[PDB]
Amino acid sequence: IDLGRVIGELIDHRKLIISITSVFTLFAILYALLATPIYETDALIQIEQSAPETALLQSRMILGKTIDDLNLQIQIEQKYFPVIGRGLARLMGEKPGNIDITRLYLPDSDDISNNTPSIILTVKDKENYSINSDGIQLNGVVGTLLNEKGISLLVNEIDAKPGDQFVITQLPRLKAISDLLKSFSVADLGKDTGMLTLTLTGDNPKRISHILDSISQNYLAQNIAVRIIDNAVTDPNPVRPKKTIIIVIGVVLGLIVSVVLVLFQVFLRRGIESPEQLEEIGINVYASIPISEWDTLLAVGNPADLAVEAIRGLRTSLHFAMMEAKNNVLMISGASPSAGMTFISSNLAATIAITGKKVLFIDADLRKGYAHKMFGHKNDKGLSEFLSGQAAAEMIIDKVEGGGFDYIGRGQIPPNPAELLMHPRFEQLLNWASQNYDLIIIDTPPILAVTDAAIIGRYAGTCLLVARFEKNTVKEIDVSMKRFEQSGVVVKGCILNGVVKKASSYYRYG
Amino acid sequence: IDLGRVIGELIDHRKLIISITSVFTLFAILYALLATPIYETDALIQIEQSAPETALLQSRMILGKTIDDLNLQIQIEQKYFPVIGRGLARLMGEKPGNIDITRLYLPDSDDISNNTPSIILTVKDKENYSINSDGIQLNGVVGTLLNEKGISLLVNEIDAKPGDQFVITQLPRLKAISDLLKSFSVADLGKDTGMLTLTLTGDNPKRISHILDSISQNYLAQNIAVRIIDNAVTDPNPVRPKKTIIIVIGVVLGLIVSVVLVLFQVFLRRGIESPEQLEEIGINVYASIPISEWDTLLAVGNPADLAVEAIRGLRTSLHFAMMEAKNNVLMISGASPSAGMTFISSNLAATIAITGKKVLFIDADLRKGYAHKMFGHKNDKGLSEFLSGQAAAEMIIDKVEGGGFDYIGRGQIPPNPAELLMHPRFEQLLNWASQNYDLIIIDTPPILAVTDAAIIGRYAGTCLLVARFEKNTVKEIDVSMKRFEQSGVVVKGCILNGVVKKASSYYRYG
Amino acid sequence: IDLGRVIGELIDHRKLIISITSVFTLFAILYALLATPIYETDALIQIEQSAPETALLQSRMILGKTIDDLNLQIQIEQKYFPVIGRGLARLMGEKPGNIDITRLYLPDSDDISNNTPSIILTVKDKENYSINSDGIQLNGVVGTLLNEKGISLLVNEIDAKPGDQFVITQLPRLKAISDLLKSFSVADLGKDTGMLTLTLTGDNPKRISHILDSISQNYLAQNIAVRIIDNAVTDPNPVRPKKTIIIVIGVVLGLIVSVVLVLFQVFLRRGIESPEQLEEIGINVYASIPISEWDTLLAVGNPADLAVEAIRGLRTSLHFAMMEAKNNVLMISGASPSAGMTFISSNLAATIAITGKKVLFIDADLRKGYAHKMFGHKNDKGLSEFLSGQAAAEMIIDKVEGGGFDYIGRGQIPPNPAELLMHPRFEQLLNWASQNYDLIIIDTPPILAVTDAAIIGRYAGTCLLVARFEKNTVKEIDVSMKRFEQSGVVVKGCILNGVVKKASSYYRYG
């Protein structure tokens, strides 16, 4: 978790980190390029206090007069069915539509919820056009006033592009004041000077300057019953969205979520990470088999594979460690199903067979052993058919043609695995084989699941646990070795398995 | 209690956590959707100080005149018998009722407690109607004034919906002023400017604007004997309830009570939680039997059950641990009643019997032993009938047909259990059985209750305590082993029992 | 990492440090000498408050009048195709071009994006000239007004130098105000005094004084409908760029990036740095061979080389350490490929051969051994052809003519290296050679890659690891020695190799 570990794991996770940071920055870029620009216009008003005037300009007396003058309760919006149609239309350089209605009158439905009745205008050409309110499309012309079904609408100088849609809202006068007041702002910048820096912000730049001029002139005429130094002009540079600030916030947010998520995943996993985690508990790791990219045995399929090199390292370390053992029986038990126990056992048997010693591979996993499904098999007369007494030692032994070693499958699943393994025929078999073979690899179920491994390991000189690299935890290995000790079985050490090529010391040589 | 433990237990308790948080958020949602909306109207008053004026507007001179003008001491409320009828009626979109009374006069009961006499109006149609005060329903019509029994009520423009009920309260003028003053508010926003931002809040939006206009105009006319810039208009967005703030508070409160309650339950329980709690005290846990979902023996009913796999693990660990013991008698004692002692003893006997050794199961719980109620029994001539000398060793031994092992029940409850067990016939029985059987499992009462276990364990080579997973505490096990030591009995170890499948290492295999 | 280490490594890295600091300071110098100078002019205005006046001077009423007077919306720039052409032109002492246009009128394209239509003027002589807008070059003369294609341009007193290019921009009046306002500044310096210290900054010094005089006089005439104490004069010393501040910032930035980068590289490397790093772990370093600057053996090519002196030191230390060893076989294994293992083994063999003892050099790296590619070879009948049984001990031994020692190459690459080395012929060979030779140096692959070294080291009395100086890490050496221990091989110590002459204690003597 230290800085060195941090940088190593971040480079290991660099794909995820850059992916999520880049996707957030892409969202930031698309938003900052599609967010409608907001322009700001400013005016300067001169008086000879000004504390009241901040509150008279923003009063519904002054603003409401501007709505009554510019007809700001008639709202016009170019229709884009997507949420980003307007932005993309601007990006393509398309001129945005605009029309002028000097007199609009909806049927005054003005319901409690839909107090803002909405109609859609369909432009057909530069002169004639139609409106769809709820289906009845009334064709009209600029100039002449259409008065049908309570629709009194007079549009003039309609825009050029045909086929466009304009949503029209006759929103209430109070709303048309409140939104203006929200977009409007006053300040003093002298704290006693007559200087008032009126600011109004909106999307339509030519419209906001007109609105602010109207506000200033209405305030002037009202105060007559004050000097407008310079009328309102719009700054051509939009003030929102702030493109630079958005993007850097996108980057910082992407990196911060990346860091929190990578630390979350680091504190998520609990499996083994290195042989030294087991060796701290006092467990001799005899090999760290790296994960092989690759039905035949890997030891005879691709003998030059790194996993087979690690298994040969295991063969030599076992050959040293298994001398002085009471007999030549080696019991390999996986710390869990899906620990790679039969992989390791079968290939270790093959690599010891090519050496030239006689190897017997007993699959004493009577519960879900499948070595017969992987070596090519005579399924009749396996191990369970022998412990049940209905077979002899010779009809159960086979020959793996590839690996070059003898093999005893489980046979049929018995209903009483543990009760079968306790039968004295099993020690008979082992005593016979240990005379007629050089090494016997017995392959047993876990010990955290059943007790079979602890029955078999009574007659085995060497017992080894197999742990998958990041699947099994240290707790499982420790509990398994303690449970083996309770039953009088000494687990010599562990075979850590399926270690990633990032963490394996093995590399291709030759 | 660490963060890892915290998250693990919260996911374990996620059902309760999400249930209570969701129910609080549901209460918050129903409240925020049923709480009557409160609208706010604002007006702006201009003067040329204003410190006194904050206190003249809110004076009973100005307000009381508005009550006298708008008849605000006549209260009208649509009747909803539930506490949430009004909210649900609004939610269904129903128009809320309202009527107008320009002249109301109750009989002026005006008692000390009920100084606000209440009557209920029953609307029958758009023109005629009736009132029930205390039973006498007087039928009346809008327009004409009904004057009966001191009821002078003139209602006009009664609402549309028939059959509704309106509770009418002629609350006192002082109350009609005090509530208005509570809902009314003034400020200055310039600290010297003539700007007064009058605000009045209420549920009826069209009514509060009228009230605030009346207040402003009364203040104007009074000050004549000041300028109203813009009259009162109501903001259509209700200011209360604050729906968003309520919901987030509901979520935060649900989570905080969830955390405090889960920590409370964590600090509530004191039972055993893991074998390592016992192993810290120096107690050898020989098995952790997981809780079986499942009258016959589980070892013969469902031999593939996980609990029977754990008992076979116990069988092998005992077989190793019981060699070198002075005799083949195993004494199993529960740390408490309801520790699963007879479950474990019976199934361990069955699993050792299927192996092929001769097992005698003695139920030396002479107080409330019920193995005979569970194996199928000849209740005559049990253990107590033998210690009393009125039976021989042969008429007391039985055969469990399922388990395949011999069995000795307690027989009849004696009046002197401990005094019976001390009789030298019991050691005679054990010395005989230990010659004619391979394993003898004696099943004894607790030691924190009686002394029988410490009498029996004098003749037992191996003694084992059985602790239920979260029922028995570590204190009970420690006190039991110390009390066994005082009596010269060595408790070899413990059998932790009924461990939950969340905490058991056993899993199904095959 | 301590101050002594810091200074030592900085002097070691002084080339990089001074290189990067000098390149940043060179960039700073070129920028500070090419950044266009910015002059500042100041004026003093006297009034009898002045808080409003700070905001009237900077108002678009006053500034816009100055643009309308001096035609500041007509922008003129001498064209330099590089980004630094203007700076270099000034540095060469060239007079900068300038022309005067009293009336300019572009075709008023004024598009949404290109609202600032740009044209380029091509001066041909002191009187006549031409303009290229988008290709159509219209020839014109100073004085007379050319009016073609909507181009109304009247330039007069055009500059001297022919062939120059002037980019002309009729930028909008609002932009011509906003840039001026950005460059303009007012202050009071008395906080109540009428003193206003107007400051205007720009590149053209004669132009900014004229602009500030125009601003002051326009403000004066406006306030008539205030006293200009001293008109605007430009300080001849440019105020930007601040040459001294830039250079010192360049130096400080260069040194700070140098420090952070050298510390980054220090915390980057993880290889061995000294023999004491290995000796801390308990590893006997027997030699530290320094890196030799130099196909024949270095021990016979340049016997006076420092690396050969270090190998003779290794020869004596080995001679002492290898007495009492079980046999005269020395196994040298590199901790990694590219550790210099065959370099060290071959030269140690040569230096022991010149002494006069019989040396056999066995190249038991059957995977990628190349001693035969370096001694001159008969490639037939190597080691692998002997273990396969298809050669005898005599046809595999050779004579290195230079080194003076016998030699056994690997031969052909076998498909089963480890399986070959396990054949009992290898111990036959060693037992024979250890009788017919004084020292046998067996050269083996790594142990972190294959298991061959641990097979060979079973029959070797002394085993030595070879670590490259900064390539191999301490972790590799420790893991290699532990993996050798697992297989029953005792690694006597290490030979640290390729140590830099900065860190080697060896020096030329004689």
Residue numbers in the entry:
A (entry chain H), B (entry chain G), C (entry chain A): 17 to 64, 85 to 261, 409 to 477, 494 to 709
List sentences from the manuscript.
Gram-negative species couple polymerization with translocation across the periplasm and outer membrane and the master regulator of the system is the tyrosine autokinase, Wzc. The tyrosine autokinase domain forms the cytoplasm region, while the periplasmic region contains small folded motifs and helical bundles. Autophosphorylation of the tyrosine-rich C-terminus of Wzc results in disassembly of the octamer into multiply phosphorylated monomers. We propose that the cycling between phosphorylated monomer and dephosphorylated octamer regulates glycan polymerization and translocation.
